[PDB]
Each structure stands twice: as structure tokens, then as C-alpha cells.
Write an enzyme that holds these catalytic residues in place. Structure first.
Site, PDB file in Angstrom:
ATOM      1  CG  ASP A  39      -5.520  -4.273  10.869  1.00 59.67           C
ATOM      2  OD1 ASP A  39      -5.326  -3.046  10.737  1.00 59.67           O
ATOM      3  OD2 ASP A  39      -4.934  -4.933  11.764  1.00 59.67           O
TER       4      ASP A  39
ATOM      5  CD  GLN B  44      -2.788  -2.935  -3.037  1.00 62.94           C
ATOM      6  OE1 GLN B  44      -3.301  -2.339  -2.076  1.00 62.94           O
ATOM      7  NE2 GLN B  44      -1.624  -3.536  -2.951  1.00 62.94           N
TER       8      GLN B  44
ATOM      9  NE  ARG C  95      -6.102   0.270   3.452  1.00 64.89           N
ATOM     10  CZ  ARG C  95      -5.661   0.028   4.684  1.00 64.89           C
ATOM     11  NH1 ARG C  95      -5.291   1.043   5.453  1.00 64.89           N
ATOM     12  NH2 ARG C  95      -5.583  -1.222   5.137  1.00 64.89           N
ATOM     13  CB  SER C  96      -3.471   5.680  -2.771  1.00 64.25           C
ATOM     14  OG  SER C  96      -2.772   5.872  -1.533  1.00 64.25           O
TER      15      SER C  96
ATOM     16  CB  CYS D 172      -2.486   3.512   1.462  1.00 67.16           C
ATOM     17  SG  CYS D 172      -2.309   2.960  -0.315  1.00 67.16           S
TER      18      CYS D 172
END
Ligand SMILES: COC[C@H]1N(S(C)(=O)=O)[C@H]2CC[C@]1(O)CC2
EC number: 3.1.3.48
Length: 282
Positions: free
Chosen positions: A181, A262, A221-222, A215
């Protein structure tokens, strides 16, 4: 510089935030006018994440052709990817329309439906064989064929039917279920194992349309997934693998979708994944 020793040099000097901010400063800025039209407000999950006009995927519809999705085309590596946000309640039909029209074989999902107590995307695939889904706005039917649950990821076989023509296709759903998370994984081993499973399925290969990867926003994440894949492929193709420059590859990918990777922790994790992955390949 090479990668593994550039890596230790940034760790020892603690300069990951400065490296990452340089990337943000140099990244391309292209218009995203279609994304910002008022009629598309409920087609975007986040107001600050939009596809560029020049690389956006168009739906084959004359009313409204818009979806928050971008085509990342990597010329030297000879790989293409579609990066998209997690589908919204009012875009699940558009999502499967895109999969159909672009001839994709696989969908790569890097998030859980609920994370941090909030919904990160719609439940857009069926959970039981006998309870199929019908998307009436785009005239598609989706059925769960089989499911294989492993410790870090789940693979599902799905049948997508175009109800207008009665054509059917098999779609593979690769769901990475254990990204934490907060932060990034401590070791890249399970993420690399997952990447290799996607590769082994044929979903990334030129005989199919581009893989669809998402994502929640389709950039973090992508971005890590396609950056690691492309860097490892270039290391196999070139005479000198130490010539692969991960920052330059990332800036090339950011010509096609804003914001890829990110955080500085995601940047460091991408380096780690490529470094470890290059040892296993040989
Ligand atoms: C390797 O450093 C990790 C830390 N840096 S650092 C110390 O390099 O600037 C950034 C800020 C917090 C972190 O834990 C993640 C990115």
C-alpha cells in the site's frame, strides 16, 4: 556511466531526489486538449493525469472516441505498450472496447481494487464462471474461464465476445497482487518473476496487439513495468549492454505519456529490477 555503479554512487551520495527532479524538469510537455473537454470529465480518474493528444488511443466510435490511455511505441526495442488508468464505473465498457479494437492478448493489472481503504479501480472482470458480465454500451460479453492463484500474483483466462459479430477471443489477465500500500517492494524478485510470466505467455509479442497495462493512474507502477521490460530487452539486443541508459529510456517513454515513475523510490526500484534481471537472463 554504467548502471550498477551509478546506482551505488547515488545511494552513497543520497541524491535520488535530485536525479528524479532532473528527469521531471527535462520531460516532454505536449498538449492534452481532448482529455480536458468538459464532456470527458467523468472519463478521467485524476485531473492531473491525462493522455497527450498525439499518442492517445482512439475508440472506434463517432459519438465520443475518448479514453484515458496512451500508446508507448519503443522503436529500437521493437515493443509497444498501452498504458491506461484503472477503469471507472462509467468506463468499464470503453476499456474492453479498446482491448477488442487494439487486438490485445493480455491485460496487466498492478493494483488491488481496494487499497488504503479506498477504491482504486472498478471490479471490471467477473469473479465466478457462472456469472458473466455484459457491457451494454459497447455490446461486449466477458466470461471467466479459469483462474490460477499464486502467492504473489493471479493469472486468469477470460473470453471476450463481440456480440455484434459473435466473434470470440481469449484474453489473459495478469494480476500482481502484492505491491505494498505504501512505498515499493523490498526485493524486485517477485516483480521480475511476474514480468517473465507475462513474457512467456506471448502477450508482449509482435503477433498480437499491444499489451494493456494499468494501475490506479496508469503512470507509476505501470511505468516501472514497461521501463524494466524495455531496458532488459535492449541489454539483450546490443553489442554493449552497459550502454543502456535507464534515464534516457525513461525520458523517451515520457514523450508518449506524462508522469511515468511517480517517486524517487520508484526510480530506485526500477534500477534495482533491471540490475538483478540482467544477471538472471544469462
Ligand atoms: C536511496 O535513497 C532512498 C531515499 N531517497 S535519497 C536519501 O536517496 O534522497 C529519496 C527520499 C527517501 C528515500 O527513502 C526514497 C527516495
Amino acid at each position: 556511466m554504467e548502471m550498477e555503479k551509478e546506482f551505488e554512487q547515488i545511494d552513497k551520495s543520497g541524491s535520488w531526489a535530485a536525479i528524479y527532479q532532473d528527469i521531471r524538469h527535462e520531460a516532454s510537455d505536449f498538449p492534452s486538449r481532448v482529455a480536458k473537454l468538459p464532456k470527458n470529465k467523468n472519463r478521467n480518474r485524476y485531473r492531473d493525469v491525462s493522455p497527450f493528444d498525439h499518442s492517445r488511443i482512439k475508440l472506434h466510435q463517432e459519438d465520443n472516441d475518448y479514453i484515458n490511455a496512451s500508446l508507448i511505441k519503443m522503436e529500437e526495442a521493437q515493443r509497444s505498450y498501452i498504458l491506461t488508468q484503472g477503469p471507472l464505473p462509467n468506463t468499464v465498457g470503453h476499456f474492453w472496447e479498446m482491448v477488442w479494437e487494439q487486438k490485445s492478448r493480455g491485460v496487466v493489472m498492478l493494483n488491488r481494487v481496494m487499497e488504503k481503504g479506498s477504491l482504486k479501480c472498478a471490479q471490471y472482470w467477473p469473479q465466478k464462471e457462472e456469472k458473466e458480465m455484459i457491457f451494454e454500451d459497447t455490446n461486449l460479453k466477458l466470461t471467466l474461464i479459469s483462474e490460477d492463484i499464486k502467492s504473489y500474483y493471479t493469472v486468469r483466462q477470460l473470453e471476450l465476445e463481440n456480440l455484434t459479430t459473435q466473434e470470440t477471443r481469449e484474453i489473459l489477465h495478469f494480476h500482481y497482487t502484492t505491491w505494498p500500500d505504501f512505498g515499493v517492494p523490498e526485493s524486485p524478485a517477485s516483480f521480475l518473476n511476474f514480468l517473465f510470466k507475462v513474457r512467456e505467455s506471448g502477450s508482449l509479442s509482435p503477433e498480437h496487439g499491444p499489451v494493456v497495462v494499468h494501475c490506479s493512474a496508469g503512470i507509476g507502477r505501470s511505468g516501472t513495468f514497461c521501463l524494466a521490460d524495455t531496458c532488459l530487452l535492449l541489454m539483450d539486443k546490443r553489442k554493449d549492454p552497459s550502454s543502456v541508459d535507464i534515464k534516457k529510456v525513461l525520458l523517451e517513454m515520457r514523450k508518449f505519456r506524462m508522469g511515468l515513475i511517480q517517486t524517487a523510490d520508484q526510480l530506485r526500484f526500477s534500477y534495482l529490477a533491471v540490475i538483478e534481471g540482467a544477471k538472471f537472463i544469462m
